[PDB]
Amino acid sequence: ASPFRLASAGEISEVQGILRTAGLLGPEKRIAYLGVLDPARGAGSEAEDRRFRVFIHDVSGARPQEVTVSVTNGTVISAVELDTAATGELPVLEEEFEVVEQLLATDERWLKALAARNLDVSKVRVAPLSAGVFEYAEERGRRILRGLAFVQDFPEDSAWAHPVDGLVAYVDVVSKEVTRVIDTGVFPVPAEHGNYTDPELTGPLRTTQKPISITQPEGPSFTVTGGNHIEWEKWSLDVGFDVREGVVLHNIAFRDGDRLRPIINRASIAEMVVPYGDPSPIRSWQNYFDTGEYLVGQYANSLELGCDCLGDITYLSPVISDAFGNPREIRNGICMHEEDWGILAKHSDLWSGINYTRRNRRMVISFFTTIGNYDYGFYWYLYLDGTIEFEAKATGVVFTSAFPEGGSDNISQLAPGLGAPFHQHIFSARLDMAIDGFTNRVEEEDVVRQTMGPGNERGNAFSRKRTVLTRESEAVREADARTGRTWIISNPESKNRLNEPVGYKLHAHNQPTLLADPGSSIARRAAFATKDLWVTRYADDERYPTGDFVNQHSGGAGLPSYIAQDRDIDGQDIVVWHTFGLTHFPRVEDWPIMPVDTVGFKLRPEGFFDRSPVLDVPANP
């Protein structure tokens, strides 16, 4: 069967047994990450080797280890001790989240701060947030979370409506100590509830919405074989799933006649960062890398039919490891379905008398994740005409603070006394490119305005220019919406019938990139987010734009250290890293639960095919 098949419960169980038998998984060990490794370049013929990478945490303070095992041969391939003070901490563990509140509830400094606010400790929830790296020297080499407090008036109350401002604490979750408690002053706790299921707030529910019924009476047009291989409307791909990255697309290819033509070898969201723009010392530290620090796949929702996914849905239920190596099924974690997408092509010709209309369709693969107050949907779309699109949907409850009486330049007011600090949500797409094969290059395409003059006497001419990125030192690119800047990935060795290199064009949304000062901690840790486009030469170990261990790592790992090798990327095995994101200035309409906002990107064929690839689509039945 396929080497790109999903991990099964049995494989996870076997990794558990191998590690135990090898002495690597005793009672003081915890698995902080487990995932299958992709096959190495050009080794699929033949022989299975299913290998898994494991990050093993030690809750007794001993050094963690990175381990790779072969489930085919039942062996441990390698086992490195990690010096986390140099190369960064392991991802946050789920059992460590609930330790923050518990420790604080018996710390005298915390209880003193609550008493001065007349707050009952049994009502105070603590949001456990990743720490970053700032000026606190004692944290280096220690596993730290920071906590901000919210009040729950009752067990089903939305705590986000009652931020406790002026107060923050730092905790060591291994030695189980509260390192600091900072109390910069009392702010009133906003009193209005934010309970969006309370009939008091919603009023009577609408009776006016009539049902929309979407069915496929003959079933769906796509087929699934081998668990996770998709065939749909000439597209072929494998849908993987990784506890860190979430959904991963492999071997995206298009059937052009009787040739299977590759387009993308691997597509993932390889990192995200959510930086906050409030200079208050209570929150000026707050940034999370949901992918790199928390592992977004681990928090995927089970998607409910008719609520989260509407129509004729096919589900995948991926298997991940819990902290002790037992398999855990994420039931209905991935939805797949096809959707009507309006008109594909249309023309009514007066001279020939022929009227022609064809409809478009897209196939959808999606999952949702929840991290604290935030909920993110990741959507991949494949269209009939060769287009590939990614869309992120951001919703949930906004992170709140008090709203200061003098006003604020960095927080918006959502309700009396209630603020929402400004922030961004930024994504890094990692596109391991394979346009008709692995010899690819990237060109920057700009519109060119031309001047009135000889050979352009009416001043109507305009044109375009393409610049080839030949080395990585050249390949850190910025958007330019004014000149219509796009990027083309082409194969110089594969030509269409017009003798031009086949290609795909990446269309960005041209949203603002990372806004923080370039000398800040977050700019160094999220260097990838300061530019719109990076191209690297493919390498086995260069998987993430921030490095492998983002938790509490200092500046510079990942992309800026990859491109310093200045490797040749002109007709080579290349990887495209695209940064895109939302700048969120919260609005009153985002409260008390926010409507979805979206951002993303798309790729469209650009001389890839010898003509339109949808000439053989039939008229609607």
| Binders of a second copy in range 417-446 (CB under 8 A) | 422
Sole binder of a second copy in the list 13, 179, 572, 583 (CB under 8 A): 583
Q: 313 and 337 in contact (C-beta within 8 Å)?
A: yes
The first and second tokens of residue 232, run together, are 């749909």
With CB under 5 to 8 Å by kind, the binding choice for 360 among Cu ion, Na ion, a second copy, none is a second copy
Reduced 3-state DSSP string for 156-180: CCCHHHCEEEEEEEEEECCCCEEEE
Sole binder of Cu ion in the list 332, 584, 592, 608 (CB under 5 A): 584
Where do the DSSP E strands lie in 398-454?
401-402, 411-415, 418-421, 423-433, 441-449
With CB under 5 to 8 Å by kind, the binding choice for 208 among Na ion, Cu ion, a second copy, none is a second copy
Distance CA 231, CA 222 (A): 6
| Residue among 109 and 255 whose Cβ is closer to a second copy | 255
Least gap, CB of 590 to Cu ion (angstroms): 8
Give just the sign of the alpha carbon dihedral 578, 584, 589, 593.
Answer: positive
Question: Binding of Cu ion at residue 143 (CB under 5 A)?
Answer: no
- Name the one range near Cu ion by CB under 5 A: 78-86, 379-387, 455-463, 581-589: 581-589
Least gap, CB of 604 to Cu ion (angstroms): 14
With CB under 5 to 8 Å by kind, the binding choice for 409 among a second copy, Na ion, Cu ion, none is a second copy
Question: Binding of Na ion at residue 433 (CB under 5 A)?
Answer: yes
Write the interaction track for a second copy spanning residues 160-189; mark x where CB under 8 A is met and - where it is not.
Answer: ------------------------------
| Residue among 57 and 584 whose Cβ is closer to Cu ion | 584
Question: Binding of Cu ion at residue 337 (CB under 5 A)?
Answer: no
With CB under 5 to 8 Å by kind, the binding choice for 10 among a second copy, Na ion, Cu ion, none is none
Distance CA 230, CA 239 (A): 8
Known active-site residue 290: yes
Task: Write the CB contacts of 334 (distance below 8 Å, at least 6 apart in sequence).
Answer: 239, 241, 247, 300, 303, 315, 316, 317, 318, 365, 366, 367
Q: 603 and 505 in contact (C-beta within 8 Å)?
A: yes
Sole binder of a second copy in the list 159, 316, 388, 435 (CB under 8 A): 159
Question: Binding of Cu ion at residue 30 (CB under 5 A)?
Answer: no
- Strand 355-371: give its sheet, edge to edge: 314-316, 334-348, 355-371, 374-383, 388-396, 594-605, 501-508, 486-495, 441-449, 462-468
With CB under 5 to 8 Å by kind, the binding choice for 584 among a second copy, Na ion, Cu ion, none is Cu ion
Sole binder of a second copy in the list 372, 492, 560, 571 (CB under 8 A): 372
Buried b (16+ CB within 10 A) or exposed e, 314-328: bebebbbbbbebebe
Known active-site residue 374: yes
| Residue among 139 and 375 whose Cβ is closer to a second copy | 375
Question: Binding of a second copy at residue 460 (CB under 8 A)?
Answer: yes
Least gap, CB of 355 to a second copy (angstroms): 8
| Residue among 29 and 266 whose Cβ is closer to Na ion | 266
Question: Binding of a second copy at residue 203 (CB under 8 A)?
Answer: yes
| Binders of Na ion in range 555-584 (CB under 5 A) | 573
Show me where the chain is broken: residue before each gap, C-N > 2.5 A. none
| Binders of a second copy in range 598-617 (CB under 8 A) | 605-617
Computed over its alpha carbons, how large is the radius of gyration of the chain? 26
How many C-alpha atoms does 581 have within 13 Å on its Cβ side? 25
Least gap, CB of 72 to a second copy (angstroms): 36
- Name the one range near Cu ion by CB under 5 A: 12-20, 275-283, 317-325, 583-591: 583-591
Please give the C-alpha separations between residue 193 and each of 319, 403, 427, in angstroms, as whole numbers: 38, 15, 32
Which residue among the candidates 33, 170, 276, 374 is catalytic per the annotation?
A: 374
| Residue among 235 and 399 whose Cβ is closer to Cu ion | 399
With CB under 5 to 8 Å by kind, the binding choice for 45 among Na ion, a second copy, Cu ion, none is none
Distance CA 25, CA 21 (A): 8
Question: Binding of a second copy at residue 467 (CB under 8 A)?
Answer: no
**CA angle centred on 58, ends 55 and 64, rounded to 5°:** 45
Question: Binding of a second copy at residue 288 (CB under 8 A)?
Answer: no
Binding residues for substrate: 288-299, 371-376
Catalytic residues: 290, 374
